[PDB]
Amino acid sequence: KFNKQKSSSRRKMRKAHFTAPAGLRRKIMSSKLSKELRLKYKTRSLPVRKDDEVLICRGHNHGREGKVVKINRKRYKIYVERVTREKVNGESTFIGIHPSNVVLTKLKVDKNRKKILDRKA
Amino acid sequence: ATRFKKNRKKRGHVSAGHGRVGKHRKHPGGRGKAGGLHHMRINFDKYHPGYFGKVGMRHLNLLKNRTYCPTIN
Amino acid sequence: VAHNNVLPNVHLHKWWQRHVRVNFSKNIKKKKRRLLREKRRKANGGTPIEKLHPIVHCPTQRYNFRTRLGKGFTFEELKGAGLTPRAAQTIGICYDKRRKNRSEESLTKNVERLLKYKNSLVMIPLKKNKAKKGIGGIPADADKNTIKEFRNKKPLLSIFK
Amino acid sequence: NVKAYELRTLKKKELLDKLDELKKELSGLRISKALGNSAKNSKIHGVRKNVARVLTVYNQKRKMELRQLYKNKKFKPYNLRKKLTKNKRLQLSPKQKAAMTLRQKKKVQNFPQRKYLVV
Amino acid sequence: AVKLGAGYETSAESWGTGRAVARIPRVPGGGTHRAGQGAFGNMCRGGGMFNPTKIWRRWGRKVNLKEKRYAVCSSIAASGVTSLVLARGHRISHLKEVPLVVSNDIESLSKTKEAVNFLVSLGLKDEVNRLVKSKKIRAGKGKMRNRKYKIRNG
RNA sequence: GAUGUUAGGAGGGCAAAUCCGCCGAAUUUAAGCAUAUAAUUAAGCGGAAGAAAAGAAAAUAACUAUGAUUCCUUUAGUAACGGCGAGUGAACAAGGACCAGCUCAAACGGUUAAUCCUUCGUUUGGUGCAAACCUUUCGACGGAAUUGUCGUUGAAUUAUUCCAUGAAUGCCUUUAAUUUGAGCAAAGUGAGCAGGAAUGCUUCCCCAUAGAGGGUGAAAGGCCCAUAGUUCUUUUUAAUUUAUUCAUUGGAAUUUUUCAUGUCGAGUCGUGUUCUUUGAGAUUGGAGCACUAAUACGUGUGAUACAUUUCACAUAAAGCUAAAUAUAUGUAGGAGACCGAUAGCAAACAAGUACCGUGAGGGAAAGAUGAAAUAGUACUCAGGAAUGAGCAAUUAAAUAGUACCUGAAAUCGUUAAGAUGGAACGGAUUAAGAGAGAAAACAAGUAAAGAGGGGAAU
RNA sequence: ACGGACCAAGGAGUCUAGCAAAUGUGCAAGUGUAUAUGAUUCUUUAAACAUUUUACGCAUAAUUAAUG
RNA sequence: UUGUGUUGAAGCGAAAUACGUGAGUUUUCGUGGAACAUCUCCCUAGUGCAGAUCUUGGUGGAAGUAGCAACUAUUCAAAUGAGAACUUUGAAGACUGAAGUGGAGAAGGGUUUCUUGUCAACUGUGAUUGAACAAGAGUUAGCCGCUCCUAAGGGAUAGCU
RNA sequence: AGCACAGUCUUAACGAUGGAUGUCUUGGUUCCUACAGCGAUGAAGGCCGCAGCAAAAUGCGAUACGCAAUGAAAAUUGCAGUGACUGAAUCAUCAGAAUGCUGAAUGUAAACUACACCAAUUCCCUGGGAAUAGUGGUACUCCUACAGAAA
Numbered sequence A: 001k002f003n004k005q006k007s008s009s010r011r012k013m014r015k016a017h018f019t020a021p022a023g024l025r026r027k028i029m030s031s032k033l034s035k036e037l038r039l040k041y042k043t044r045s046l047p048v049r050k051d052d053e054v055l056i057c058r059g060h061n062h063g064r065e066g067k068v069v070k071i072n073r074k075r076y077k078i079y080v081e082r083v084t085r086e087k088v089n090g091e092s093t094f095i096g097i098h099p100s101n102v103v104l105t106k107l108k109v110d111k112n113r114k115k116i117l118d119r120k121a
Numbered sequence B: 001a002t003r004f005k006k007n008r009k010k011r012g013h014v015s016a017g018h019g020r021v022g023k024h025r026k027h028p029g030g031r032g033k034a035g036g037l038h039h040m041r042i043n044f045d046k047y048h049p050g051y052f053g054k055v056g057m058r059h060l061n062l063l064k065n066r067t068y069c070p071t072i073n
Numbered sequence C: 001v002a003h004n005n006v007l008p009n010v011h012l013h014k015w016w017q018r019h020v021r022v023n024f025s026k027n028i029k030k031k032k033r034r035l036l037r038e039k040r041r042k043a044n045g046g047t048p049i050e051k052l053h054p055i056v057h058c059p060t061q062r063y064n065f066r067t068r069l070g071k072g073f074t075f076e077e078l079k080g081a082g083l084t085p086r087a088a089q090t091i092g093i094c095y096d097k098r099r100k101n102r103s104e105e106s107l108t109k110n111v112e113r114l115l116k117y118k119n120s121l122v123m124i125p126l127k128k129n130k131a132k133k134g135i136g137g138i139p140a141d142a143d144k145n146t147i148k149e150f151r152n153k154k155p156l157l158s159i160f161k
Numbered sequence D: 001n002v003k004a005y006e007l008r009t010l011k012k013k014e015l016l017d018k019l020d021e022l023k024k025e026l027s028g029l030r031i032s033k034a035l036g037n038s039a040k041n042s043k044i045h046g047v048r049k050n051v052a053r054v055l056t057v058y059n060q061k062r063k064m065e066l067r068q069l070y071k072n073k074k075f076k077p078y079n080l081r082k083k084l085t086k087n088k089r090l091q092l093s094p095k096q097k098a099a100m101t102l103r104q105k106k107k108v109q110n111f112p113q114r115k116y117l118v119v
Numbered sequence E: 001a002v003k004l005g006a007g008y009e010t011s012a013e014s015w016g017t018g019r020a021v022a023r024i025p026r027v028p029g030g031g032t033h034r035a036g037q038g039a040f041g042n043m044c045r046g047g048g049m050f051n052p053t054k055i056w057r058r059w060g061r062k063v064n065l066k067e068k069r070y071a072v073c074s075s076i077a078a079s080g081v082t083s084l085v086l087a088r089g090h091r092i093s094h095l096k097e098v099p100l101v102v103s104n105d106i107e108s109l110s111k112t113k114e115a116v117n118f119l120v121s122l123g124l125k126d127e128v129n130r131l132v133k134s135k136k137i138r139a140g141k142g143k144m145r146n147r148k149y150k151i152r153n154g
Numbered sequence F: 001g002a003u004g005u006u007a008g009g010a011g012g013g014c015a016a017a018u019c020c021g022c023c024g025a026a027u028u029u030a031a032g033c034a035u036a037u038a039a040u041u042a043a044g045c046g047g048a049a050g051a052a053a054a055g056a057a058a059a060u061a062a063c064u065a066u067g068a069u070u071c072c073u074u075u076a077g078u079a080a081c082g083g084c085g086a087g088u089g090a091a092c093a094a095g096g097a098c099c100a101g102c103u104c105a106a107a108c109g110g111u112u113a114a115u116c117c118u119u120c121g122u123u124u125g126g127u128g129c130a131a132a133c134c135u136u137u138c139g140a141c142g143g144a145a146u147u148g149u150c151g152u153u154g155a156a157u158u159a160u161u162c163c164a165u166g167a168a169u170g171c172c173u174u175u176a177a178u179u180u181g182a183g184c185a186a187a188g189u190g191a192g193c194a195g196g197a198a199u200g201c202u203u204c205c206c207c208a209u210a211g212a213g214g215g216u217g218a219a220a221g222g223c224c225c226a227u228a229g230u231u232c233u234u235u236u237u238a239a240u241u242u243a244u245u246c247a248u249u250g251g252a253a254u255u256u257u258u259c260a261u262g263u264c265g266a267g268u269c270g271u272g273u274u275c276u277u278u279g280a281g282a283u284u285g286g287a288g289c290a291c292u293a294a295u296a297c298g299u300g301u302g303a304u305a306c307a308u309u310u311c312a313c314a315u316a317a318a319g320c321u322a323a324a325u326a327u328a329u330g331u332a333g334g335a336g337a338c339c340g341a342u343a344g345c346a347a348a349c350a351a352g353u354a355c356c357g358u359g360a361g362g363g364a365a366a367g368a369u370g371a372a373a374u375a376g377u378a379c380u381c382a383g384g385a386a387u388g389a390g391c392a393a394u395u396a397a398a399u400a401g402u403a404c405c406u407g408a409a410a411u412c413g414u415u416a417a418g419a420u421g422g423a424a425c426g427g428a429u430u431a432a433g434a435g436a437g438a439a440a441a442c443a444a445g446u447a448a449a450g451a452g453g454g455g456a457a458u
Numbered sequence G: 001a002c003g004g005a006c007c008a009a010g011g012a013g014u015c016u017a018g019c020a021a022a023u024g025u026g027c028a029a030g031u032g033u034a035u036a037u038g039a040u041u042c043u044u045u046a047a048a049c050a051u052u053u054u055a056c057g058c059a060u061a062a063u064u065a066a067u068g
Numbered sequence H: 001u002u003g004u005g006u007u008g009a010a011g012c013g014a015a016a017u018a019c020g021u022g023a024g025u026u027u028u029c030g031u032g033g034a035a036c037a038u039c040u041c042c043c044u045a046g047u048g049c050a051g052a053u054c055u056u057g058g059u060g061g062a063a064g065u066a067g068c069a070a071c072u073a074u075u076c077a078a079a080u081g082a083g084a085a086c087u088u089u090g091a092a093g094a095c096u097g098a099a100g101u102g103g104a105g106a107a108g109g110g111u112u113u114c115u116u117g118u119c120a121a122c123u124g125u126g127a128u129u130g131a132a133c134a135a136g137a138g139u140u141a142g143c144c145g146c147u148c149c150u151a152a153g154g155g156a157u158a159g160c161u
Numbered sequence I: 001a002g003c004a005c006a007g008u009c010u011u012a013a014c015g016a017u018g019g020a021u022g023u024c025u026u027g028g029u030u031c032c033u034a035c036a037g038c039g040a041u042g043a044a045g046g047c048c049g050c051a052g053c054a055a056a057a058u059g060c061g062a063u064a065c066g067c068a069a070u071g072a073a074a075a076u077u078g079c080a081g082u083g084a085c086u087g088a089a090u091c092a093u094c095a096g097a098a099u100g101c102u103g104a105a106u107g108u109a110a111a112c113u114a115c116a117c118c119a120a121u122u123c124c125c126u127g128g129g130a131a132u133a134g135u136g137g138u139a140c141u142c143c144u145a146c147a148g149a150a151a
Helices: A010-018 A022-028 A035-041 A111-120 B006-010 B041-047 C026-043 C075-081 C104-120 C144-151 D012-034 D043-069 D086-090 D094-098 D102-110 E065-079 E082-088 E104-108 E112-121 E125-134
Strands: A030-033 A045-047 A053-056 A065-072 A077-080 A084-086 A092-094 A102-106 C055-057 C067-069 C121-123 D116-118
Touching: A030 A035, A035 A102, A053 A077, C055 C104, C075 C104, C104 C121, C121 C144, C144 D116, D012 D043, E065 E082, E112 E125
Parallel strands: A030 A102
Antiparallel strands: A030 A045, A053 A065, A053 A102, A065 A077, A084 A092, C055 C067, C121 D116
16 A cells, blocks of 8 residues: 555456466465464464365355365365265266365464464464 | 537538538648748738848847846836 | 738747657656755765855856856965865865956955855864864864764755855 | 485496486386387386486586686686676776776875765 | 557558549558558558547646635635535534634544544544445446545545 | 787677767658758668766856856747748857866986786685685796886975874674565454345444455455565665774875976868858858968967957867766566557467568457356257257356357348338328327225334333 | 448547637736755655745837947 | 445346437336446546448348359169268270370479378268378388589679779 | 238347447556666577477477476376475476577588588596597687797
8 A cells, every 4th residue: 555666456466366376376375264273373364275174154155164175276266075066967076165265173283384383473 | 628629519510610612621822831922922911011021230149148138217 | 821820930840759758757856866865965974965166256247246156166265265176175165277266356255155164164084083183274173072062963054055 | 206415425427327227217118108008108207307307416516526626727618717798707897997096096095085064 | 648650550552543442541462351451540440540649748737826825725714614514515514613623632643443433522423424335336447447446535 | 021720818790769970862841843941850881888978168258257068947939041932040148957077198207117918826814505706915937118118297495284004902882774585464254134156235343553456156444365564684874882002114285495487289270172061141060172380479269251459268189087868679666537359559369470472571360158167068869960859957047058248230030910003211190900008197085994114202 | 413232330620839819717017936946745646835035938118220 | 426236237129198399318128147327516538420432340132143064975783871973893885095184203382192080161063082180100222313523603702992 | 620822011029140239358558667788608580309198379408398406385187197294296586507400600511411620539436447420629800928930
């Protein structure tokens, strides 16, 4: 708003969003944390990982929970284990769900996650 | 200001107010001050009498600062 | 031409669209110049960026009565103030070798201006508390206390005007 | 698959023969691909990248030892010496640009621009 | 302004006396759709507008300083009369007086919440509501020119 | 002078928007046209930089005088030029931006080239992990140079006063600015309605130094990125910290007393003539040719050609120089009362692409399913197949089925109604039919019971 | 007499300079703060605001080739 | 300034006991699926089309019409195939008539060659054919040529402009 | 099960053809700001290649849709395959390494992958041990230095 070095141009920044490399996409695909582990890690949002327990609170599946099973940065989507749907031909595929529509309920912490929560501390 | 222009009120009038017979051509009398003494002579003599010719002697470089002289009564 | 108009005189018979230019950046350039001069007066650390110029009389009978800032004090004026041109140009005094003092009035007025500037000067030591009494007409070097107490006081920029 | 850091410590022999056997197995893979067989075709990428890594390490070692050999001597080969822009190479050195005669040098030492204040 | 030579970057040729076609210039050559098509001219597709917009349009205006000062003084005077503010559209039916002035400690308050609270306590709750609910996306292609919203002035 | 695949080096080509030289039109205007204008332009040739070029008076002025160059405001469409027609057209002063001055030549130095370069070595220390880089002065060698490098800016003499010197000992703080890269960064995913899906509507809470924008299944300050703010990190750069002894080695400014009035750019200036150029006019600059100077008391300028002469100004024929200035180029940022796929660049796309021409060159058309194809049409029937149909199927939706948003007109098909003797349509007036229609085209009120909504009254 | 087979979309008195008249506005023998400067203005803001008691334009005086 | 939108905006089709004199405005139904006005006042312009042998695109009547006419000529039976006048095989009648629709090359072309599939479009009728489409494959030199020589001539060096 | 003459023209409803209108826009345009030369150390430009399946565009150069290093850091996937429980999968940065044939093109040539001359060359171990017909150099003009010849 006050930093004139950064553009507020609609076309410019939606081009940035739709051509962002995978590195920026991993941060764009962050999601809200639940109240309890938000208190635990004293932070508000976190990029989702392949093995996180999540609760979707928006869309047709707005009550379901489940461990996410795949993250597709090309389509800006995540997939959770039990939110499959049937195709016309008749096999099942996961329903693409935007990370902004879900809230983290349990994280998988590793050597590299501990350091980012530490940096947040 | 373009919506106050007179051409707007002749939008569907074919000739745009420039005549159906005489039309609006490109320099039908010449360009600039072309016709002085020949076919614009009446205009020149009626509105700019002493236009043609020269009178008086030359002052080769003037330097107006020399003769600058404001007056008060 | 037609009717009672002034005879046209427009000098647009060449390719003028290549020569049209419009200054959209007049105030932007104002800001840039202001920023540059602020930056250099911060860089030189207290000493003003303005240089002292003499009071001269405008030429021709048009502007006879008016004075303005000339470029450079004369050799005679610098000598009357008691300093050499080479030394004077190191303390923000402009010197030119072209002007001459045809009148005692101009000579004394510019000499007194130079003396006022010299008295207003406070000299910072070249070697950090190695104050020396100066050469070439440069005033003696001020010491630590007067430098400290004068550095936090508004500079007298009216002398340059 | 092989990483650069593990073979950064090898001698030039153990690097060259490793490259040779890697190339031999890549050639075998290419022959198999040319035949009807295609099961192992996906290994060609990995073998090629391993060859690239071995060549990178070997060439970096050779360049480093060549630079060590031409240490100083003020007459290095053109590829060894600086590869700046041509204009930058032909520019006068800062010392040459700042070089000043005795007369003006003594003038500026005797009469330097000096800081001052105004009342 | 449009690009300086827009629509005029082709080869000029109007071979059209006896071709049974209009005398407009046509692009030369063959082997492509463009060949033989109407070249530059305000009526031709891809042919350049009638009077190309130029950067040396009179963008700005010089306004007399006295007139500007007169306008500012008049605007202050107009802000000083209750009926005019109501007519302009501020919901001021609940403030005490329209030339309202507040203590200098307004200049020191620093929280937006307390600024809003002060505005409400002055009797401008309706004005604040009008301002906050006026926010909405404008019509037209201005919203793809970094002009998305349209707000009312408080 | 040659010659050298001797050692070490340089030039060449691309790119041009701004910049520097040359060369050089015509269209056009003059209502014809030849001088003039277009234009000291376009095209052509060559040459540089982040700017270039210009630049420290052989300058103005005529005043109480100014003081290198460049650029802006103005002088000024003025002085002036011009078939004195069309047209063309400066300079000085004034106000500003910026501001900077210098060195060769000539002079002087011969109890001594006091200079320069090449190559080979030595160390004085420092930042780099490294790579590499910055400082270092003792040389030796081989050359160049008296057919002239270097020092001085006339040369000495006193007085003060300044500037460069080495060694030893200690000291490297603190702040403000400026500038990279990184983090942190408030508040709802609360009811209810409807929806495939809120970010919508009601309603209840809040955050705001953040209500810029973008994304998210519909319009989001409180869902996500980011935003306001702030904290670290990078560049340099001001002020602020601290300097103390010992020593001799030079240099500089001014001021005392003398010698001596020095030097100052030659086929150059200038003049004549010719051509061009200029506002420059008995010639503004440039160029060719011919003639060809003076020596500072000279010689150049002082906008009308001369002769005699006063006065003022400047000191040509050698050279360097930052800033203020310009940038239809390249690259990178940021914006807009701009265009919204026949528009905007030629090109929103696999665009200078496809394609055309022997070649120089010419040069398009072409965007949109859906929220999600990780929902792109499964199954059955009929067909050789393409396809079609379904009781079958994804979707909120397939008359959203890949030519897929919407889906106009021209043109055509189906059904219905009507008209129909060498045009058809139409104006005006009605009549018959056929579609629609109650907002004036009747019934306010009153009583009962049934469903509700409000307001006042404690 | 010429143009028009049909339909859609595009399609032509504009922009700048300079002068005048007309009218509105401000000030008035003055008017316009030019370039430029300053300022705890710096998303907007490339706009707004401002100008230590003879810059300049036009006007305030005309006429003459002209010394005037 | 003050408003409409998923309880359906813009647009579009047909309309209206609608209003206006009129340009138009406003409504209804249907379609549509995401934006839209502001007439409170004002600012701004690339602002209003029947024509320009106008520009670009699309589409007509002509019209199932002109026409599918050089090269004497075809016929019987079978195979394949969903389908055979113009694919294949056999038989017959004929043609080209060594100045050849016969064999070799050059220029030009560039994979059209071969085999196997194969028919959306093309092969101006059909087509199962094909120079079309698809997947593979195919060009082997001491002796054939280039390469070497010099020609008409071209470029360059030295100079000179 | 039966009935409408046909054609031509008009109107309505629904369609076909077509792609207008509306709404979108990772594009353009203009202005402002900042930086600014590339090349014999071989540029710009042009060819030729490079992926497991690979035409174009984009990227790259025999290490060839990428190596190394640094920061982030778990995905990348059409199949096949490759990844840790972070020098590994993928992004970003990009300094090291590498950078085919040409092109000012510079050994001679050029609708030639044609032809010279001079060094043989390169690699491995710490003077030997191998492999290579492969690798460098050779333009014209000019400067400094040097060389032996000449009057």
